[PDB]
């Protein structure tokens, strides 16, 4: 009696994301999600019972392992030219994408954009989703050649751009105190020395390692706005951060942003290789999506439902403040690690997630110690600490940059990352803590 | 005592599939495989116990059901740049591909293209992963504007060539007979009318749907070799066929060709959205490699290596002589129940996988009865069995097609395809040709 | 839509079984079987969404792996005052039994008793279930203080009786060409001379190992009906055999049989630990069932389940009649082996299931030839294969058996077994005889 | 590399587990787990590569969904001779068989039964379990009959003494402020009236439902060693309190407890079917043990294997932990609700687990008030919570309790049950605080 009654329950959970399309406040149970998963995997015309199938792309699984492991998705998402349209022998896969697209622009919003018009999954990473962009843009603007881009040192966004057939602007950043951040008068000085006409768009960074910070969107927004240039922000692991969200809410209010870029696995601890392309303008993020030739994997977009419908925005609220905490916690650890060793936390305020301290108190002249202590936290099972000497020559696609990974030529001193990115555990620091300095003794 | 000798036979499996990257003959049990799954997985940092992580990207998973679906890995294929190099934090997703690319290179061979010299699976469609061999061309070929195409009425190849920013030269095909097939005279004029130079490359296609065939390979690679023009073939689905196989071999041989496309869903069973380029220029095909920006998804690869480790290169050897099988038998119920209806199999004995039916007798102008077949088919749970009426007027990207889906403008008749891919059954063949039949008895 | 009239499709199979309570013919597909148990598990109140919980016995589980790999069923079966009670905190559990029981009662019907009038899944291996028989005799007949049987060498069903708290009267079996078979006279003699009222029950044993033979249940079932004394039936492995099945459904058509007892892994390849329990006499195999104390797990239910509708009664058919083609196949098989070695093939008609060779060519006596050929098989990993010697002495439980795995004090000779059970292939066999083949030669 | 001293992690963890046979201190990685189970099944000879079986027990799986589920181990545990016996085809289930009655045993004496020598795990529930000691009693006592029962009203365990072919002398309880405790002098007259060779044994109980409270096991224990007479604990529950367990360890300090019994599911959150008999002669529960006829189920032996090891001894500890706080919280919760309703707590203190609520101004003698309560309750999805009125008459197998379900033929007044038993969390508290006041509100 209470039996069919107590399918009503899971029903009306399931009834309210679908006509709403919002993450579930508090997370559902995992009964109540794979009967949902189930549900919608048997609207597949590959799991109809007595189907038959004459085609070429019948969705046919060979391993029982593949086709279980993906909840017996086969078909992908999109049509043969855009990706974004209702596939006829995949209807449930079609509302898979639909309704994760949904979340993930509820959260969007949640997370500091409230003003996001249209988003949607790719199952590419960052980088490539990048290129997309620009591969969208060239059709647009005929003439465009370059892409002025303030320079942060990370391989994939920096080759999105030549990928996409276009060259890079590097536009080198002003050291104010500890921090490099955008700058305004180079950038405004490139568009006049090659035009609006000849400029792809304006290719700008908000999270990013210290002692970098994120780019001055308002005032590129302006500029691109002025000149009516097309603005791309590499928001690679920005919508953990209050701060960088509000930025680029900030930057659509008072002036241009056409499209910002967020990495899956960054911004929602899933497998790598799914991203996230969203706007403020409809059309524009819907030509994006048109632009992409053929079916994509539903891997990505499954992961993420998966994971939000588990958290409920509430959940991810979580996540959010207690990243808040562990970046106070870490810096703290940091300062007191720091001062004890001569070294200190660099002061980079406008970047809330990444941290950095001074190492100069390491010889890496004399006896390589500042890379030293590189490779010795790998092997003390130390992960994401990254090092940065002075000095560095790395050629990327044909260009080459002088100081790696400093964003800049001439950093003064050579630090050393850490970064509070979410999911992120109080063990995680004090093991950090405790390992960096077993290291550091061991150096100095 | 029998326990940890049980092991070594396991054990020796595993070795002999590392130390030769070559399929099993016979397909692995599921407990040698999962054992060698978790064996991989546990070499990844983020499964390290004990380990910590101060980074942005440390594979943090927030659903077990998500961590468990992939078999824990979580760090995708590749690094920041560089998509075919070891990633230092992921040492057994970087193994995982390196065998997945060999295993495939192995039955790439198996399948007819014996001289194959380097291959590698990328996690986007086939359309996508031509438009990465596009943006390749692009950095070696600065004067190109340029690519020419044998027509074949399937949007996202087409659209592969939009996307990455260059323009269609669209050849006609030449009707003999029945078949559709390159026009060779038309094409060696277009080279002459823009010039080598101005070519991005040739793009040709081999699997299809009848009554196209596969593009004269062997031809195309002589010009090819000839004005020094790239030469990219699109083989969907071609890996199934030993005629599609052959003919690219054969084109090597005489000729130039510099990368081959395939699907991975068609060739192997296996979710939508991963693909296959390969070629006989090691360097370029590592250059294509390089070309993709940032790390990919490692699902489709543990797709495919599942799939090929349970079959063994026997039971892939088995699917394939089932559909050579299976297509004469489907042929044969054709000619059978075409001769009942007064229409005939139209010859197309160039074309091994894909068939058509004559629809002569089926009045479209007056009561629409080619279209009332159509989705007539789908309502009865037939899939794959692509009907095209006369004079389809569609357009993509810009582009108008007249005769849609029949790759020419004027085709004598309306017709129906059907085809034998791989993993088709004698059920599927038997279930169409009963409902084909019911069908069209209420229709003429 | 086409995908809400899918899972139509899917409810229809599981209303079907439902209301029918019997086997579908052809198996159902994983989706629809993992759909069913989903609907299912929901239905415990452990599984509820609004449930809090303030008992000893509320179904919690600690770890999601277990929870999972039991589909979230988690109360077992029953109420602590009988096992065929439904259970208020799991209507879902309660279901799950009911419809086990009704399919498994189907399929023994298939097999051939088709005049079975109840059953019920125990989760006891078929020992305790025999014992548990036992037990419930004990209250009926409160003089009974022996049990009558007709000796076979298998530990499981002589401690049964021993355990149930009565003394076994061993009944010698009569040398009938090659096979042992019921000695009649001497079982009907204890019954005069011990008197009917203090015989419990006469216990017999179809299934056996060659070359005894299922007892003459038909003169049984008479002797037990005219002396007003239960029977009880081993059938531990008998519903595989429309033989041992026809020869109980005889025995019941003639005279009396009270229960027959078979073993859930031997009969329908599930894992060790459950049994079926069946009678004729409704009330009576109620009464069994009632004699239970407390819950009991409901996990071997659920791999019969799942078993019986993953196979379809066709499924199971199938391997029925592969298991009969199989017993020929090995028979012929050894028939020929035993010539090159001056052995025969035992001529043993009366059973089904079970064969043996002459090992009269080999010294025991003289140097463990027998023995070591036990061994020697063992090494080369052939399971199942029992080699007898002469002379074995074994007590069990303080009664001493000479001969013991021959089921007699002398038998003629040494001997082999070998069996064709459900689900054995032609491999097996071939490389038994082929390993049986190397042994032999290597004793010589 | 880094990956290959990764395995090397979980080998050491593995190592130390079948060493030492004890729980890990923090719980397991699921990887680690899984690596570990995946070694084991390995070791079952159903499991190797090369394997041919021509036997009636062969380990063979219909459905991979079963083999899966179950990690692929299927021979059950032990011989058909003895459960405690190494099965020689199973290797692997053998050796998960001996570390879970290790692990158990070492919990055991971490929950406060230090001097426990021996125990196993067997797949049968608390009542069969029950029975099964006295099944074994019955051959070391011929003349017993009688089995002594200090009164508590839970239908498993009163029937476990009938099945077992013996007669329950039932002892009524002595009212004690508001608790139920044992009759002493009641017991040992009985014992003197029937005389101590007609005694199988004392049959005590610690876990219960308030007012009844543990047995004073201390007195028992002397009395059963005086009189020679075997003592059998009833401990169902009793695990996950320190109280209980207490009361055992000076049971067996002061006098004589032949053994205890409890449940898998009530004490470790696996599901129902399984537990675990334990004592201080190791001699004596060995016999226990191969009294068992036959193989038998090793599921419930998996889970409680799955839980220990990925709670660790911690995890356990804390659930423990959280069970006596949410006991503390739950009765000033219930202090607080009965106050407003001018009811009271009943004083239990000698009840650990178990509380009770008076029920005393609801007029179940003018209209159904308390059994109204209960259903009423039973419809807001509460569960455990138990109404008990006064005069309840049930008969069970024969034997009429008057005020059944109240331990006592005469108990004060009518109540409430409700627990805190391990898992308990505080919004289940809180669910049911609120629900009942609603409840009571409604009813009044
Ligand atoms: C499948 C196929 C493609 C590739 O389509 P995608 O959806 O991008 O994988 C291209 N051309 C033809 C003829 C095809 O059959
Ligand atoms: C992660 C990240 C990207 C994107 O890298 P992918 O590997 O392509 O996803 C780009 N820029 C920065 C700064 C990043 O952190
Ligand atoms: C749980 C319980 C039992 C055992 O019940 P089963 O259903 O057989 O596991 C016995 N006595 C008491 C007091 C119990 O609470
Ligand atoms: C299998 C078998 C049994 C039952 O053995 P269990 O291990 O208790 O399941 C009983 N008698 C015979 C002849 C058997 O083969």
Not at 3 to 26: D, F, T
Request: glycine share 6%; with cysteine.
């Amino acid at each position: 009696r209470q039996g069919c009654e107590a399918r009503r329950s899971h029903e009306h959970l399931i009834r309210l994301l679908l006509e709403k399309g919002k993450c579930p406040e508090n997370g559902w149970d995992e009964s109540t999600l794979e009967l949902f998963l189930h549900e919608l995997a048997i609207m597949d015309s590959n799991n109809f019972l007595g189907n038959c199938g004459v085609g070429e792309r019948e969705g046919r699984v060979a391993s029982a392992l593949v086709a279980r492991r993906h909840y017996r998705f086969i078909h992908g998402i999109g049509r043969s030219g855009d990706i974004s349209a209702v596939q006829p022998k995949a209807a449930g896969s079609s509302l898979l994408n639909k309704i994760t697209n949904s979340l993930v622009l509820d959260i969007i919003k949640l997370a500091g954009v409230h003003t996001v018009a249209n988003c949607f999954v790719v199952p590419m990473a960052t980088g490539m989703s990048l290129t997309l962009c620009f591969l969208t843009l060239r059709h647009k603007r005929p003439k465009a050649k370059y892409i002025i881009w303030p320079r942060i040192d990370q391989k994939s966004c920096f080759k999105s751009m030549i990928t996409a057939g276009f060259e890079p602007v590097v536009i080198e950043n002003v050291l104010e105190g500890d921090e490099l951040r955008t700058d305004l008068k180079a950038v405004e000085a490139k568009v006049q020395e090659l035009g609006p006409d000849c400029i792809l768009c304006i290719h700008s960074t908000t999270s990013c390692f210290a002692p970098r910070v994120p780019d001055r969107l308002e005032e590129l927004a302006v500029i691109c706005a002025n000149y009516d240039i097309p603005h791309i922000v590499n928001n690679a692991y920005g919508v953990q951060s209050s701060k960088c969200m509000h930025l680029i809410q900030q930057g659509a209010r008072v002036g241009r942003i056409d499209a910002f870029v967020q990495s899956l696995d960054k911004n929602f601890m899933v497998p790598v290789g799914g991203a996230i392309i969203a706007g403020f303008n409809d059309s524009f993020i819907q030509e994006i999506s048109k632009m992409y030739p053929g079916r994509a994997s539903a891997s990505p977009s499954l992961d993420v439902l998966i994971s939000l419908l588990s958290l409920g925005s509430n959940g991810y609220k979580k996540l959010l403040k207690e990243r808040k905490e562990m970046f106070s916690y870490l810096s703290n650890q940091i300062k007191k690690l720091s001062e004890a060793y001569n070294e200190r936390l660099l002061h980079t305020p406008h970047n809330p997630i990444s941290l950095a301290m001074t190492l100069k108190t390491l010889d890496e002249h004399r006896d390589k110690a500042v890379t030293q202590l590189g490779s010795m936290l790998f092997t003390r099972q130390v992960s994401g600490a990254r090092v940065v000497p002075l000095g560095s020559m790395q050629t990327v696609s044909g260009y080459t940059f002088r100081g790696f990974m400093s964003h800049t030529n001439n950093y003064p001193c050579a630090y050393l990352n850490a970064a509070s990115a979410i999911g992120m555990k109080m063990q995680d620091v004090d093991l950090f803590i405790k390992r960096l300095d077993r290291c550091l003794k061991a150096v100095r």
